[PDB]
Design goal:
The structure is a homodimer of 620-residue chains. Chain A has 620 residues and is mainly beta. Chain A contains eight helices and 34 strands. The first copy, chain A, is 9% helix and 41% strand. Chains A and B meet through strand 9, strand 19, strand 20, strand 22 and strand 28 of A and strand 9, strand 19, strand 20, strand 22 and strand 28 of B. The structure holds 2-phenylethylamine (PEA) (2 copies), copper (II) ion (2 copies) and sodium ion (NA) (2 copies).
């Protein structure tokens, strides 16, 4: 019944029927993105109109289209031819992954470079990498992928252990044309294998680990209704899924007594970028927007009970469209469970004799995606005390190169002859805020040090200051760990019992932001990543911090174009965009498969409640 | 058999016998600290000499003594009269807590102030607070506590809800003399109660929480031998306990193949300080060194199964001395268990078809202590992948005051009329390092941004630089979150298979350090807290960053005096001291009992191993 319900296979089949009938789904067409649109502001007209947005690619070289469709009214709402030289290319198609290796396999320049290295072309895997926008004028308006080669010694070999350095090719995947092959020199292909299931590398497996059994004999404390509506420990929300963004959280609210109090209207990871810091011409173009270019949701893993998710697990199996409009189920793609989280509150009082201990718990909503060598887990946490936390877990295999003789300032050595270029993994969280409603504002809070003197005779005082961000042009903010800088989202029209505005405080990890030179192509395309915090006024069409068509866009779209409007954000419907990321200098211990590293952020209540909201938690 | 075994009740009884016989334990004497000394460098003489250090107080006003005793040889090794005007007072005695309230109860000035407020003296609790060193010349060489008053409406009432502001007294606990009573004005005593077990405040308890059952059907994966030696998942260590520091970790090592490789020789929280930022004369002197002044280990809680520690718990029950030298068991004072920790490593490979998932786990060693209104949990974590992490969990009841009419820049309002002064909780971790042995060095690692130009034509390159700290005078370091600053402890004489020195990287949280004015008394007494990282050359007598006698010491002892020696630390036996802390602006949600907040640090292997050390972990 809910307008925020997951798309169903039936809805997908209708969209495919509608597109076919209208002549928009010919055998040269491919669906490159399909997703449900969120209800517009003012859904209190309960006239549900389930609408879908579709990007349609044309493998014959015709212009792609953006199409909005109403499943409710069986009609095509709008259909727009796209000039991709202007507004950017469509996302990489899954079927294009193989095409790069196959086209290079018959190219004489490619075969020439492989033969000079005594490599059998049948052993050479080619990674299909997004191209970016650089100096090659012939690429404007064309659908280009770049290829880097790895050797597989046998079909179960890990190809990442055997990079072929000094060699890169550019491919036009529509006209099927290898446009350039660059061979800057021969590097030895690193010889050692990286097969982490080979007993010769693992040694004998441990026998010392004894089982941990986590069970809920009475079932879990949360309920799921309508497919994707969660109620757990006063929290209420809807779990959505989008093929670009992955898990999306809607209508996050907290039942405080009788009132259902909104907190966040929509929470997602709206973009993520991985820039490489190796200046070698073989790799200096390498940056991928896993979310905007590849669509992380469509590579979500099926999560196994007992391995990926442990305990009493409830699964969601989201439905997406394949390239032809058929629905495909991602079986067990979202794991949902509660976890014990230690002590929540504890005190033994000398004067009253009361001994008091309460335990904490958290609700976990997670998925995993795999794009090439990278593997990422996305975790949302809801805690008893009102805290919301996001955590990204990065694992998989690092992207490799040759380690150059005589070393490198921009590459780590992982094994003899084998290197791993320096890089970052940078995320953009989009938080469409709704603290007790839609009239919200953001204050920047800094610790204030005070000088010894009148009024502060012993030199012990310290304070804090808050600065309201009133317009978009002043709402691009940087971290300052040294002054304890945080940001508070409050509702100036909703006060707690002390007559102060209710609020939530955003605590960032204060990791470095984008390191690339501000004049670089990547700094222009990933401008969001150069600052920790942006606040915009809400608008229907401002969904992604990089714009709608990231692949081969020349830059500037998204956040820097939005904030130029300089709209009022002081007590308005606002959106917080938080940049956070990992700077990865690979270590030996990351090889041949990488232990998880993490990054994230959290939001804690700041005078949102009238006292601690967990006074009614019982003893264990 | 191990020299690092916990002190036994029998050893304590011998110490009491030895002291008595020597005339050092008369009925005017009180033991203010008793602890085992660590074996000296060069314990390869296996001539175990179990030695104890004792601080002896004299309630009659005579000079206290420091005494070293050999339980092995039944002899007093040394005994030193202390001039406390010079080297500081002995730690607060537990029996002195009540003495402040009892002495004030008969003082006419005190009774006068209470009667003006219509307070029944029988209802008024007095917190015994350490005094510090300020402007009162008559306090030098005297044992002074300061008292702040709270009202208990009935014996089970939470007194923290009813601070009596505008009133403070100073007390000499040896001569039993109220030296000053200061009454700066009357404030209403806040009326609301803060009784978090009162159904009228909690409302009806939740019935929605269903149980989480954590069990180990085959028992835990770790073994304990010799009372306190742990072996778990290639980790080996000894768990010690000291009445000042609490849980101490000795001989942390990792079994890498056949070799037992040392990592850390001794790890402890060696000091912790809570400075208050309220400039009011009633509280502007308030700072407590919970570790150095009060001794956190002697207030360790007994931890309840299912409430404090959940799962398959192994307990240690450490033995300390009471004020007369009798042994007392802290029943179940240390909890020890392993926890599941999510995904350790995961990859699904497009080219090989291999799907690979492994789960992580961690070994937890924890205790809780309670000093007055504050409650703190200390958690050490050991992970499968070689990571070591410390986490402090802060809870209990916030320290309260009146909220002044017309507001405050240095106090938060928690309830009508009730305030909570701004403060910090700052910890000092002392890491006596032993990365593959005792020849260690520290490098500071900063990210390096590179300019677009020759060699970096696309402006994408970035790098890192490492700076060796060679002498103590250059080994006082500050955080820089903006440049990703970390510190690496390496052994330049031990190389991995890539011929690079083995190392561990320290990742800090980059929270603000001491905020007080550098000319303040607290900045002098807690100088360690003004910088994030100190490195010293190891020395037997350099145990605490504030020195041995913190109570009423005038400042400068500890770290700033140690590093003045300017010793060589480049490939030597070194000690890392890491300052980290929480800056607490109390919120409504912290009242009437505070949800846990956390801070900590972690160390990760940095080319310590020759590849990932968890390749031999099995599938679940
Ligand atoms: N993360 C997307 C880049 C990528 C895509 C496919 C193979 C290897 C790398
Ligand atoms: N943390 C030590 C300060 C303290 C001691 C006893 C009661 C209240 C406060
Ligand atoms: Cu990485
Ligand atoms: Cu605090
Ligand atoms: Na909003
Ligand atoms: Na050392």
């Amino acid at each position: 019944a809910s307008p925020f319900r997951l798309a169903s296979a039936g809805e997908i089949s209708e969209v495919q029927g509608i597109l076919r009938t209208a002549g928009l789904l010919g055998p040269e067409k491919r669906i490159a993105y399909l997703g449900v649109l969120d209800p517009a502001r003012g859904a209190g007209s309960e006239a549900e109109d389930r609408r879908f947005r579709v990007f349609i690619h044309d493998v014959s070289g015709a212009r792609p289209q953006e199409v909005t469709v109403s499943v409710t009214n069986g009609t095509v709402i709008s259909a727009v031819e796209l000039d991709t030289a202007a507004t950017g290319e469509l996302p990489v198609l899954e079927e294009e992954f193989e095409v790069v290796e196959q086209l290079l396999a018959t190219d004489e320049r490619w075969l020439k470079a492989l033969a000079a290295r005594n490599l059998d072309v049948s052993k050479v895997r080619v990674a299909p990498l997004s191209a970016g926008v650089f100096e090659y004028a012939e690429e404007r308006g064309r659908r280009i992928l770049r290829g880097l080669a790895f050797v597989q010694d046998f079909p179960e070999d890990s190809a990442w252990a055997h990079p072929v350095d000094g060699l890169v090719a550019y491919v036009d995947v529509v006209s099927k044309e290898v446009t350039r092959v660059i061979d800057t020199g021969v590097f030895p292909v690193p010889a050692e294998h990286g097969n982490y299931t080979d007993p010769e590398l693992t040694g004998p497996l441990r026998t010392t680990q004894k089982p941990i059994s986590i069970t809920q004999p009475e079932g879990p404390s949360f309920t799921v209704t309508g497919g994707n509506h969660i109620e757990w420990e006063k929290w209420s929300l809807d779990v959505g899924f989008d093929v670009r963004e992955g898990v999306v959280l809607h209508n996050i609210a907290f039942r405080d007594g009788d009132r259902l109090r909104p907190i966040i209207n929509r929470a997602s990871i709206a973009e993520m970028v991985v820039p490489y810091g190796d200046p070698s011409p073989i790799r200096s173009w390498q940056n991928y927007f896993d979310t905007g270019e590849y669509l992380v949701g469509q590579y979500a893993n099926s999560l196994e009970l007992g391995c990926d998710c442990l305990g009493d697990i409830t699964y969601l199996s989201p439905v997406i469209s394949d390239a032809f409009g058929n629905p495909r189920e991602i079986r067990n793609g979202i794991c949902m469970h509660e976890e014990d989280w230690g002590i929540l509150a504890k005190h033994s009082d000398l004067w009253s004799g009361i001994n008091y201990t309460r335990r904490n718990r958290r609700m976990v909503i997670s998925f995993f995606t795999t794009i090439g060598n990278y593997d990422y887990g996305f975790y949302w946490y809801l805690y008893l005390d009102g805290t919301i936390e996001f955590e990204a877990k990065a694992t998989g295999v690092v992207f490799t190169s040759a380690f150059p003789e005589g070393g490198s300032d921009n590459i780590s050595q992982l094994a003899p002859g084998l290197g791993a270029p320096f890089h970052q993994h940078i995320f953009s969280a989009r938080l469409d805020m709704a603290i007790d409603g839609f009239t919200n504002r953001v204050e920047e809070e800094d610790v204030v040090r005070q000088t010894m003197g009148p009024g502060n005779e012993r030199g012990n005082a310290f304070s804090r200051k808050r600065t309201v961000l009133t317009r978009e042009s002043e709402a691009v903010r940087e971290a300052d760990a040294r002054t304890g800088r945080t940001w508070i989202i409050s509702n100036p029209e909703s006060k707690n019992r002390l007559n102060e505005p209710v609020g939530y405080k955003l605590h960032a990890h204060n990791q470095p932001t984008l390191l690339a030179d501000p004049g670089s192509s990547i700094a222009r395309r990933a401008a969001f990543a150069t600052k920790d915090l942006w606040v915009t006024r809400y608008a229907d069409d401002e969904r992604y911090p990089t714009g709608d068509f990231v692949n081969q866009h020349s830059g500037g779209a998204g956040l820097p174009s939005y904030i130029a409007q300089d709209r009022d954000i002081d007590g308005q419907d606002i959106v917080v965009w938080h940049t956070f990321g990992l700077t990865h200098f690979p270590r030996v211990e990351d090889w041949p498969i990488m232990p998880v590293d993490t990054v994230g952020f959290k939001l804690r209540p700041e005078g949102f409640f009238d006292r601690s909201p967990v006074l009614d938690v019982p003893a264990n």
